[PDB]
Structures are given as C-alpha cells and as structure tokens.
Amino acid sequence: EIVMTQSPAFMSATPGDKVNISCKASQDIADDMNWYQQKPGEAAIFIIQEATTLVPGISPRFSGSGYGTDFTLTINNIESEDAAYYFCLQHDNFPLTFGGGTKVEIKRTVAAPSVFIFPPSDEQLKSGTASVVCLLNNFYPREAKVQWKVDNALQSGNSQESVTEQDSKDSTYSLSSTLTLSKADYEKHKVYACEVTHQGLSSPVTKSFNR
Amino acid sequence: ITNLCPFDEVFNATRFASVYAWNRKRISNCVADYSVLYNFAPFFAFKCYGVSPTKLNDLCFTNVYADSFVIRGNEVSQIAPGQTGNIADYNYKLPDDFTGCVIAWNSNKLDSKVGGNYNYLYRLFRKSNLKPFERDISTEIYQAGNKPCNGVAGFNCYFPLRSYGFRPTYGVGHQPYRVVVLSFELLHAPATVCGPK
Amino acid sequence: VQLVESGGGVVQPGRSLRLSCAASEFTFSSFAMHWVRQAPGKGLEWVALISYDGSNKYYADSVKGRFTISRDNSKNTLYLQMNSLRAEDTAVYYCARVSYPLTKYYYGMDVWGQGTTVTVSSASTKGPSVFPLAPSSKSTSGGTAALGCLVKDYFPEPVTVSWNSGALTSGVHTFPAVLQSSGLYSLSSVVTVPSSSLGTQTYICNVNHKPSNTKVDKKVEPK
C-alpha cells in the first residue's frame, strides 16, 4: 500500500499566472503515474500519461514533470474553463491508490453580499413547526459568517447552512441559513435575527423579524 | 591448439540487439575453452540448468547456441523455464525443460546516456503468446476503434513497440542489462565441440 | 467510445444488488476493466479489476468475499454483484477501461464513465411537502424582490425543481439538498424578481418527484 499525497487541497487562481500541484509518494515508483481532470457532472478526462508525456488532443498549456517520489503538474495561462477536479493516480503495484484532491477556482474582485429574510408560512404553523430563513447573494469570498440571535441570545443548535457552487457566468456565490423549531417554542419568543459578517462589508449586518 | 570458438564476439560486442528481435548464433567445429568467460568478473547471474556450472570442458557436444538480448535489470528473473511475465509472453521464452547456462551482467556505463537512450525497444501486446525460441518482428498497427488507422497511430490505433528509457540517473532496476544463454546439444551427428587438450 | 453505468439505487443493509456497465464503439472483448468507487467527502478508492479473457480477477481487501466481478463479451457488458452490503458501501461507482489492448501487465485506465449512486439505508420512501416563501417589505431592495418555495422532507434524494414550467431560469438558485437530524433531505429554491412585477405576474413551483410519483405545484403567495 503506497500512500499518495496531493497538495494543495484548495486554491484560488488568478486569470493569469501559473499553478503547480504536487503529488508525492511514500515509495519509489519511477514514472508510473497519470494525471486526470474531472469537471463536476461529467466524466474524467485523461490528461497526462507517465508523468511526462502529454496526451494528444489536450491543450499544450498543461505540463508535467518529476521522477522518483515527487511529481509536479503545471498549468500556465489559466482561463475560466480550467476550474475542475485534478487527481494523480499511481498504477505500479496492487492495490492501485489515487491521490487526494484539488479544486481550482478563478479569482475576481470582492463583492458585497445582499441579505434577505423570510419568515415561516401558515402551513408550518398549522402543521406544528416553524422555520425562519435568511439568504445571502452575490459575494465572491466564501468567508461569510451567519449567527442566530433570539432575545439577544446566540443559538448554535437546530440551524442548518447551505451554499451553492461557483457561478460560471460572473463567479458569484449564494448561501442560505435555516432555523427550524417547534410551534410551541416559536410562539414564546417574539424577536429573531440573523447576523452576518463578511470582509466585503464595512460592518456586520443584522436582519431581524418581530411578530 | 589453433582453432577456437568465437565467444568474444557474443560476449564483447559494440552493441547488443533488442529483446524482441534477438540474436541466435550457431557454434560448431571448433575448440571451446570456457575459462575466457570470466573476463566479466562481476557476473550478476550465472544460472546453469541441467549441467555442472564448472565441468563444461568435460563433454563434447554436436553444437551450441548463444542467445543474447538486452532487457531491464528488473526482468532478468523471467529468463527461466516455466516463467510468466511481460517478456516471457511476448518477447522471448525458454522451454519448459532446459540445458546450459544463463549469464547476466550490468552495462550501465555503456548503454545509458544523458538525454535518454532510445535504441532498445520491446513489444507491448499480441494476440497469442510467443513459443519457445520463436521470434516475431511484425509491426502492424492494431485497430480497435471502428474507423481504420491506415498506417497512422492515434486514438484506438496502437503501435505495439515501446523503447526503454535508459539514463544514468536510475535505480538498481530500470538499468540496462546484458544476457547470454548457452544451450548445449548432442544429436546423432558426431560431436565436434569440446575443450582443449 | 462511451461507457454507461446503470442499476444503482437504495437498498436495505444486508441485501444484494447488481450493477451493469455497457461499452460501445470499440472492441469490448480485448480490454481489461476497472471498478472504482468514491465515497462522499472522500478521495477515490480502487475496488476491482478484471482481465480481457476473464481468468484473472483482482479485488481490494476491504471488499473481498462479498463483491463478484464478471463480464459478457457477446453482450458487451460488465457486471458487479454486491452481497451483504453494509454502511460504508454508500458511494459513487465508476466503470473504467484499461489503456492498452491484449495486455495483462499494464493496469492503466484512460476512459471513465458517468457513474451511479448506491445508497445503503433502511428508510421509507416519502413525498415532498412544498411551502412558499412569502415576500415581505424586507425582501425588496433596489426595485427587486426575492421569493421561493421550500421543498421539505423526503427520503429519495433526486428532486427536480423548476419555475413557470422552465420559462423562468434567470436569477433562480437551487441549493444542494442537506440532510436533517431525522435523516430526510430538504432543500430550498429562491428566485429574485423585480418589485414592480409583484402582484402582476404568475410564479409557480414545478416540483417533480420521480420515485413516489408526486405531482405538487404551488404558486407564490403575496402577503
């Protein structure tokens, strides 16, 4: 069993520049590896064979190098459609082991998110449950932190978060936060709020609802 | 003692031949002294089957063959009867029974050169396994896809030969090795090959 | 050249299933095949290997004695049979083809497939329950307001959501389904519209659920 380590797991890519991805092996394997690219939703693509040979039909921007235990994949002159999942595989001895993972994302300017709030509908109330949601849209950096405040008390339970993927058109993001409780507990308290902090905003923004 | 068999031609050649299209040499009607063989003192392998590895001079043989090829040092284990592997199946095979000797010595200082040595090749695949002492040099592009290849290699059109990558900076394996196999025979006709007196 | 996998689905623990991989536009009988899998949130893991003639079969240690690999050259099919399934078998399964033909010592793959999903759970099939997200005075900003419907609670994960029979596909976002404490998925779908169009046009949720044959549609409810 040869443990194969890939670095880095995540990265941000400028519209230009070059990027190097390192694949390392715990034993000597010579040139017995391949590099594959897989876009989300499609099948994997055969990119590099034997760590040095470029597969015909692929753009000459991709390159590979390395013999022994250390190997490097180099991408030069990045474009928008170069965002995918890259992995390194070794096929020297059984069992075959893959690398780790690497996601490349195109970097652009920071955008201030827009925050919206939605209260529960009467269907939940007659059902016996309450759900309050608040969503953030159109912000580039994923480092947006949302907290739930009821009666100036922070709640770290019964709350769920969801985030979409990178936008193909203009590289934006979206996120939703949901808080679900029972109708008996919902009736007691009156004020609710979701408070969001994001580096694209000068100050944190709180969206509240009282009823 | 005047006439002697030409062992230095097989053991000391300027360059050997590729494993797939290998050499066979017939030696007969001469005097064979096996003491000269030890010029290559660091003999990596000296496997001898069905014969004493020392008393070669004792017997007189009708003729003797000398098979020589160059392979990767990680594969010299496939030169033996009843063996399976990449080379035993497609490039060169030994019979289930054997007689003679097998001799191997490293040649990293003569074959591997900077920039990669691309003169020695081997066969990837074929429909059926090679026979004992069977040689195949046919190089036709195998067509797996629906569209024909027309003598051009590409996707679903595979060339059956790849060249060993030999460079001075390599491990103990993946370095060039040289092999000689000596097969002793005697059959009906008078024996005309044995040692000096 | 193409590879298609099929036969996935939900199965209770301890039971059996069979997956089939179909190959076309190439000679299936002269290539070795690989079965690979990827667990959620984890890297890919090799599972099994079969040769072009079928004599040589290789299995991973973690799946020895339970999975069987086979092939049918006449029908151009590859079969994987899974028995005594357990909790760690939930993953996405991939069918791959070895690069070189008529070879038994290469073990290198070049062509992959789309993949199928196998879920090992003992839950009960349920239908979605839609609830609209009524727009409010807080939901408008710069002449535009957001509105949506929150599909909630269903075991079979694949659920398709569309708006106005697919006419409205601008400004709409469908977030990934997230598991809850009770073990049933629930997601949201929100689309933003100009504030002037509120109360003048029709916006509906076209929620289509395949396994339970669910036909529920909900119109946005202004309040």
Residue numbers in the entry:
A (entry chain I): 1 to 211
B (entry chain A): 332 to 528
C (entry chain F): 2 to 224
What text appears in the publication on this structure?
SASR-CoV-2 uses RBD to interact with host angiotensin-converting enzyme 2 (ACE2) and ensure cell recognition. Here, we identify a highly conserved neutralizing epitope targeted by a broad-spectrum neutralizing antibody BA7535, which demonstrates high neutralization potency against not only previous variants, such as Alpha, Beta, Gamma, Delta and Omicron BA.1-BA.5, but also more recently emerged Omicron subvariants, including BF.7, CH.1.1, XBB.1, XBB.1.5, XBB.1.9.1, EG.
However, local resolution in the RBD/Fab sub-complex is only 4 Å, further local refinement focused in the sub-complex was performed, and resolution was improved to 3.07 Å. Despite the significant antigenic shifts and structural changes of Omicron RBD, BA7535 still binds to the Omicron BA. RBD at an interface covering an area of 722 Å2. Most of the mutations are not located in the BA7535 binding site except F486, for which four mutations, F486V, F486S, F486I, and F486P, are present in 24 Omicron sub-lineages. Because the interface area avoids most of these mutation sites, antibody BA7535 should have a broad spectrum against most of Omicron variants.
